[PDB]
Write a protein that binds this ligand. Sequence first.
Ligand SMILES: *[C@@H]1O[C@H](CO)[C@@H](O[C@@H]2O[C@H](CO)[C@@H](O[C@@H]3O[C@H](CO)[C@@H](O)[C@H](O)[C@@H]3O)[C@H](O)[C@H]2NC(C)=O)[C@H](O)[C@H]1NC(C)=O
Ligand SMILES: *[C@@H]1O[C@H](CO)[C@@H](O[C@@H]2O[C@H](CO)[C@@H](O[C@@H]3O[C@H](CO)[C@@H](O)[C@H](O)[C@@H]3O)[C@H](O)[C@H]2NC(C)=O)[C@H](O)[C@H]1NC(C)=O
Ligand SMILES: *[C@@H]1O[C@H](CO)[C@@H](O)[C@H](O)[C@H]1NC(C)=O
Lengths: 96, 100
Amino acid sequence: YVPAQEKNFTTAPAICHDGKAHFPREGVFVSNGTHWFVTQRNFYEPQIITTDNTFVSGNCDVVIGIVNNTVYDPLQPELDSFKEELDKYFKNHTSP
Amino acid sequence: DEMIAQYTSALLAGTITSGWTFGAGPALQIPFPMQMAYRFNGIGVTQNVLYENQKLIANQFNSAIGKIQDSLSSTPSALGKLQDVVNHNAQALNTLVKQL
Ligand SMILES: *[C@@H]1O[C@H](CO)[C@@H](O[C@@H]2O[C@H](CO)[C@@H](O[C@@H]3O[C@H](CO)[C@@H](O)[C@H](O)[C@@H]3O)[C@H](O)[C@H]2NC(C)=O)[C@H](O)[C@H]1NC(C)=O
Ligand SMILES: *[C@@H]1O[C@H](CO)[C@@H](O[C@@H]2O[C@H](CO)[C@@H](O[C@@H]3O[C@H](CO)[C@@H](O)[C@H](O)[C@@H]3O)[C@H](O)[C@H]2NC(C)=O)[C@H](O)[C@H]1NC(C)=O
Ligand SMILES: *[C@@H]1O[C@H](CO)[C@@H](O)[C@H](O)[C@H]1NC(C)=O
C-alpha cells in the first residue's frame, strides 16, 4: 500500500467546548477554514465532532493549542426528538 | 565525508518535520509538538500525558542531550568499536611488510 497525492489543512491539538479539553480517540482535528472535522490518519474521510470519538481530560488552560467550536453528543439526536416531544405535550394541560 | 554528512542531515530534516511518513512514499508535514503525541500513543499511555505536561518534558529532553556532550568527552574508551576497525587493519599491514 502506498499513499497517493495529498492535500494540506489547518489543525489544533485539542478542543475546548465547556471549559474542558477534548482529545480525539483516533486521528487529530483538521479544518478547511470554516468548521472542523476529525479524520483518519491515512485517508481523508472527514467526520463531525461527537462525544463517541472524543474523550475529556482536564480543563482547557494547560496546553498551548486550544481552539473554540462546538462538540456534539449522541443524545441530542434523540432527546431533541424526545424531551421537546415530552415538553410540548405537557403544555396543553396548563392552558385551561 | 561531505556528502555523507549531507545524507545524515536529510534524515534529521524529515524525521523532524514530516515524521515517519517519508519512508513510505509522499512526505507529509506535521508539527513536532503533535508528532510526539503519536509516539506516546504507540507505547500504551494516552495523548494527555504529553499535552498536559509539555513544560517539564521539554526540559528533560534538552538536558539529556546536553549530558551526552560531556559523556563523549569524558574518556576515549567510548569509541572502541570504531577504533578497532582501523587498528585491526593498520596492524595487519605492518605484519605483512615484515614478512620480507
Ligand atoms: C469546508 O468544508 C465543508 C465541508 O464540505 C464545507 O461545508 C459545506 O458548505 C456548503 C455551502 O458552502 C454546504 O452546502 C449546503 O448544505 C446545506 C445543508 O446541507 C444545503 O441546504 C444547501 O443547499 C447547500 O447544499 C455543505 O452542506 C457543507 N458541508 C458540510 C459537511 O457541512 C465548507 O463550505 C468548506 N469551507 C471552505 C472555506 O472551503
Ligand atoms: C474560547 O472561548 C472562551 C469563552 O469566552 C474564552 O475565554 C475567555 O478568555 C478571555 C481571555 O483569555 C477572558 O478575558 C479575560 O477577562 C478578564 C476580566 O476582564 C481579564 O482580567 C483577563 O486578562 C482576560 O482578558 C474571558 O473572560 C474568557 N471568557 C470566559 C471566562 O467566559 C477563550 O479565550 C476562547 N479561546 C480562544 C482560543 O479564543
Ligand atoms: C389541547 O386540547 C384541546 C382539547 O379540546 C384541543 O382542542 C387542542 O387542539 C389541544 N391543543 C394542543 C396544542 O394540543
